[PDB]
Symmetry: C3
Subunit: 366 residues, 3 copies
């Protein structure tokens, strides 16, 4: 039983793959928190003039840009559409679509992303895989399984024939720097379903779904406002939490959350169906906590601010708040709350009215 977890730990990457102008970090997909969740996380950072070479995957992928500005281009089945991006942006990558990424400024692009290996679209097995169009490099997840591109595996005679070019150029196509190359002079490529928009900024926005000036803000990107996400059946949440503010106990009725802290630190508590407090610790920058589906999560911030991206596995996730304005205890008859918690008619009124805030709750004022 994958999801029968006794103790969640804040996970770190166990794989660093330094390339010419970048780095690839990957988290072990065979640790039970990731086996339960069904995703595979990764963190690609691309330095100035770096170009992530073309690659595709056997599952939906959703990329969050932690920092940097670049151009990302998809090759959906001169040249196709190139999309500009910024920090805060959420990029949708439908199953098997090949894409590439380039950074041009000093400030390295750091993009953290998830491959939902447990998707219905993933017709292979639960192993994450990346198929690169070029270069002779071992793909990020090869270590977990246990190199070349998909093009280098072909015989020269076949490439010569398919491309209709001579043996000499066929040799370069056949392999012969890792995934993230550095462009010497830099690309001079123009700065701006085939219609589908796959870029929706949830980080550096000014339209919070929930906004509390004394507690923080929380933005979400569901398929409602970011419709390419229905193709992925994936979601993402960006939250900024002030010091000692909190996000009330809650649960995702229909989704698995992968909380990746972008900044600061926060003390978190997740409890299960048995009431066991499976994680009672702190989650820091660049670390990850996986909250399984109906497990309840609570967080109190320790920084100004605690920012995070929670990749949920459902394009329309539904959260059930256990405390605050729209809670599950609030929608209860004042009498049943009395008999399930063993309370007085006066106490039940406090549990149902004392916190007027939705989702985010302000510091206690100590």
């Amino acid at each position: 039983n994958e999801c029968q977890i006794q103790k969640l730990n804040a996970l770190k990457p166990d794989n660093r793959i330094e390339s010419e102008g970048g780095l690839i970090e990957t988290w072990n997909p065979n640790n039970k928190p990731f086996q339960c969740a069904g995703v595979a996380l990764s963190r690609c950072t691309l330095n100035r003039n770096a170009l992530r070479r073309p690659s595709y995957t056997n599952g939906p992928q959703e990329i969050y840009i932690q920092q940097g500005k670049g151009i990302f281009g998809m090759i959906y089945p001169r040249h196709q559409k190139i999309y500009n991006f910024r920090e805060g942006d959420l990029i949708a990558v439908p199953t098997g679509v090949a894409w590439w990424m380039y950074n041009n400024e000093d400030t390295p692009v750091v993009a953290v992303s998830i491959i939902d290996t447990n998707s219905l679209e993933n017709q292979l097995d639960q192993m994450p895989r990346r198929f690169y169009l070029a270069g002779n490099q071992e793909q990020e997840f090869l270590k977990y399984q246990q190199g070349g591109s998909i093009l280098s595996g072909f015989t020269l005679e076949f490439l010569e024939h398919a491309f209709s070019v001579d043996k000499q150029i066929a040799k370069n196509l056949q392999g012969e720097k890792g995934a993230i190359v550095t462009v010497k002079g830099g690309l001079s490529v123009i700065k701006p379903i085939c219609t589908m928009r796959l870029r929706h900024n949830i980080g550096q926005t000014s339209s919070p779904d929930i906004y509390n000036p004394q507690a923080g803000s929380v933005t979400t990107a569901t398929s409602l406002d970011f419709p390419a996400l229905s193709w992925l059946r994936l979601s993402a949440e960006f939250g900024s939490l002030r010091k000692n503010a909190m996000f009330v106990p809650h649960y995702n009725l229909n989704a698995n959350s992968i909380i990746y802290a972008l900044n600061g630190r926060a003390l978190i508590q997740v409890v299960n169906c048995n009431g066991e407090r499976v994680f009672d610790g702190e989650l820091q920058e660049g670390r990850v906590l996986i909250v399984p589906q109906n497990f309840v999560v609570a967080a109190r911030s320790q920084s100004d601010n605690f920012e995070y991206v929670s990749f949920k596995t459902n394009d329309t996730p539904m959260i059930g708040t256990l405390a605050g304005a729209n809670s599950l205890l609030n929608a209860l008859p004042e009498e049943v709350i009395q008999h399930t918690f063993n309370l007085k008619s006066q106490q039940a009124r406090q549990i149902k009215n004392n916190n007027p805030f939705k989702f985010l709750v302000p510091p206690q004022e100590s």
Copy 2:
């Protein structure tokens, strides 16, 4: 191979939790019939003035009320809309939604429900598990796994900050009588997707799909006549059969079935793909018979009347009756039926016309 079943058996519960104002019985989900079916069956019984404390699961539940009257409430993501139930009601509970159940009559409410652990909505694993909003009590299925509520696992200052209450009522709220709890005086709460009907009656009271004055009647609730079921991707079927009558051999094209014998006793026969009669015997009251996807069933009523609830795992189950007005042999040309059964034309007609009834056949007439 989980559904490669040798011999089935009319199963009775293995677990029992006597609660202050009621009881809970659960069938072992780790039995091959149940692993094959991909469901977790249990039967709660609410005594007079009992309340069932709010809980929720990672899967589409479908409750059936064997007997009783009362009011049930669902806390979707003063208070929310309560619905009144009577026996023969089918309640649809979406994945993850919390619900509470209350009985006021002397008569105990009996409800048999399944949890489709093999749902698409179930992102965890094949374990059944309930998430109780309150109390200190071990969840029904913990047994199978091998405490408290989700609230009793949290910290006092987390709970105080969350609910914005004093440490005295937060400590109550923190779990400090099992799942079912008697309301001493009794609730004063009335007896009359937010607007979606999630209760339908398939009791004898309801107009049946099939009615034969000498055989019985069959009423089934699908997503066409009960639309909320297209959310649970589940459905149910009530059936009453006069003594010695029988429902013809038939198979569900697209759904596993979980026959719960409510009243009386019967003599069922289910045969598989290899022609092996994997069950020949009797399914009596309070017992369960699992009949997989294309396995053919036939039952002779040994009582006036044998009554059942068949939980199908599909919102629009399609059945393929082998003998009847509607049957497969009937749609077969007389000549091709001659040749598959080594028969004369005139005998072939007997097979396509002797029995003129749909699904139900009157007693043999002896």
Copy 3:
């Protein structure tokens, strides 16, 4: 990991079942190619006056007709609708629907087909299994499990009562020549969702998708063209390639393919996520090669013509062409092609335009 394929081999059946008027051959569903793919291939040939007795499976089935003409009737939940078929007809058989087939010419019908055991519609297990309506004989896939039909498993009094006939025509119904019997005189039943067409032609008698008078043609049947396929979540592709012409390196973004060679031979090459060439060999008639989801495939015909059928597990498969008019590299900016392959502007142009052809490229001409 089921799809961690080391080496693929051009598979062939390991099970011959000679019947009275025909034959049934099947491929082992437990090899890693088929476990990875998630299907069950089979090839039934019926000779003159042969009838394939009524049956059904617990999954989506897609039947392609290699050769011959006959009729096939469906018995969807006098008689039902019978369709005539010819070579190149792709019959969509929705989950659990019972059907029978008949042939009346000297030329045997050779119908190769697939049962997708990894379907959402399949609620049993991954073991393929056919349920026969009549006759004592063992089911094609019983060999893989480790008989008689579903009717010959009931107690003689149950059939008697059910069909409302006597002990004698009840024995003839209760079993007392295999699945494909010979209809001595001949089935005189006239040669012509209820109305949803489940026969569509893709063979050499069609108006092709891709056509090149020097390379061949490719005709694809998706749910766009044949709407009954969206029920199956399956597709097929018929291709005819002239000697030495080739279909460029390409991958299916969302499907597994089961390439069954109809006529001739071809030198096929498929490579994986690690640039390993998992298959470098010849695929000839009656043999089959499984190209898992994002694996790249390229073939070069060694015959006039190499004809194949490609069962893809997705009703709307999207392919990524790596070389050709509409290829992935064709859409890449000349400058990123220069930097990902280590080429110059001019060479980059040669890879984008030397092959002016979509998917099929002609002989090299030497």
